[PDB]
Amino acid sequence: VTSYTLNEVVPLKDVVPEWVRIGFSATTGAEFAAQEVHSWSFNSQLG
Amino acid sequence: VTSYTLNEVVPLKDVVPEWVRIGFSATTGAEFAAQEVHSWSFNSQLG
Amino acid sequence: TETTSFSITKFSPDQQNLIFQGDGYTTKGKLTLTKAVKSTVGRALYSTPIHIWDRDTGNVANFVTSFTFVIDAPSSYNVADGFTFFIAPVDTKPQTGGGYLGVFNSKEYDKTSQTVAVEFDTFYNAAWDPSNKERHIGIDVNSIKSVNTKSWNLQNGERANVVIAFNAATNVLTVTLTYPN
Amino acid sequence: TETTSFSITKFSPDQQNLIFQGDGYTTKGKLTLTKAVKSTVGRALYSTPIHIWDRDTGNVANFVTSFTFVIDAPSSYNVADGFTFFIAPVDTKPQTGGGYLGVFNSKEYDKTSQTVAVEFDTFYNAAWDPSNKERHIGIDVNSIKSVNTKSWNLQNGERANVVIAFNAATNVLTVTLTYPN
Ligand SMILES: [Ca+2]
Ligand SMILES: [Ca+2]
Ligand SMILES: [Mn+2]
Ligand SMILES: [Mn+2]
Numbered sequence: 311v312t313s314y315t316l317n318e319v320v321p322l323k324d325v326v327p328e329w330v331r332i333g334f335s336a337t338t339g340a341e342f343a344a345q346e347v348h349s350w351s352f353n354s355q356l357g
Numbered sequence: 358v359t360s361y362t363l364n365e366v367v368p369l370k371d372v373v374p375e376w377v378r379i380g381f382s383a384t385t386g387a388e389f390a391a392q393e394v395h396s397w398s399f400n401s402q403l404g
Numbered sequence: 405t406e407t408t409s410f411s412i413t414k415f416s417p418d419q420q421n422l423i424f425q426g427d428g429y430t431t432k433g434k435l436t437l438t439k440a441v442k443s444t445v446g447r448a449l450y451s452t453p454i455h456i457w458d459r460d461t462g463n464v465a466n467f468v469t470s471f472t473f474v475i476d477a478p479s480s481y482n483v484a485d486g487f488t489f490f491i492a493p494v495d496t497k498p499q500t501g502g503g504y505l506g507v508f509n510s511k512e513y514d515k516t517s518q519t520v521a522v523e524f525d526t527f528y529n530a531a532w533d534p535s536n537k538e539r540h541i542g543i544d545v546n547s548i549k550s551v552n553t554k555s556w557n558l559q560n561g562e563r564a565n566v567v568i569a570f571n572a573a574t575n576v577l578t579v580t581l582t583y584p585n
Numbered sequence: 586t587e588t589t590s591f592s593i594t595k596f597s598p599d600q601q602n603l604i605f606q607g608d609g610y611t612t613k614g615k616l617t618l619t620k621a622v623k624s625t626v627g628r629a630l631y632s633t634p635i636h637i638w639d640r641d642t643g644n645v646a647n648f649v650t651s652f653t654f655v656i657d658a659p660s661s662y663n664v665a666d667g668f669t670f671f672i673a674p675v676d677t678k679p680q681t682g683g684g685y686l687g688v689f690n691s692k693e694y695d696k697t698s699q700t701v702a703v704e705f706d707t708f709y710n711a712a713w714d715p716s717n718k719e720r721h722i723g724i725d726v727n728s729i730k731s732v733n734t735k736s737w738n739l740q741n742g743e744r745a746n747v748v749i750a751f752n753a754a755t756n757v758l759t760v761t762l763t764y765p766n
Pocket of ligand 1: 485526
């Protein structure tokens, strides 16, 4: 198994609106590659 | 506690489309009342 | 596999994951479908399309919904028309008002309606309602004329708790309504 | 209290609870954001708006997402530009492509962006990427220049499992990426 972990403090209330959409993006340029997602799970709790 | 329960077989596959919206409806006529919902929760599991 | 859950125990005056139709709005922590005004309709859909069966596999979803509602009428003998939980195609908008509860247009079986509703029907429509004239819980499939009804005693201004559960194994839809007293 | 939860382990040709943008689409059980073609963008958003903080309470949401993705490039030395998980306003549209990854427009702090992204960035852009020139995980806040980066070795064609988690009490965003070998 190989893993990588990164953390950062982000003050979300100061950066994003109260309501949001979540999503994936990918791009290619001159060099390129296929970018695919096989599964996606999500949970949040406000209050 | 006063409770009421009702059961019926509904063949969902033959009545509604694969994708649906869920929601609430209320109407008044010449007689009338306020209709209101205080909390709502929902879970669905396909496959 | 594909699952979806959500709980709102308390409604924002700006609830961007709900679609409001007619009078429906949020005030004061709650979802109001109608004021105590007459000849009116309100609806509120959850915004996201639900994947209820899969043509691929012919799998069908298990689902359960829980909600708390209050009907507040001027008097035990002045109350109309009632309230539903329904399931419908993604593009659904209000159908006929009054006894048809904003969800159906006919007492005859309409398979173009593609709507199952659970009704909490507070007013006797002689054209289709159970003859006993009692208020009642009904299961409605493509018609305002229920395929099964249970007699229900309205407790005016009291919160009712409802659970509605559908067992895909069995195609049994189960409704429970409870009052505290 | 609001919560929201969902799980997709296989994508339908007709995934009605996603919004596709650019070359985004579903094929074979999977969500394809780009194929291996030059100068293209794909995004896919979950269709429901999420309530992430409340102006009223000043509460902020805890959340966790996890997903599996694959990057499939013609070799180890022909790969660009990379892949994000992002959080953005409800009406978000694709932004500049190429090394701005469809989500941002400049390396300068742009408080109108209101977008947080976690990038898996496969191409050194000399103007903003870490100078060691390696491939890397970054936390991006209103800018293509990450606030924090971790060097990461792309395993071409392999499935990575990502979890991203946000603790509201702490305002810490954690990202972990795991490969099987
Ligand atoms: Ca009636
Ligand atoms: Ca880059
Ligand atoms: Mn009836
Ligand atoms: Mn970068």
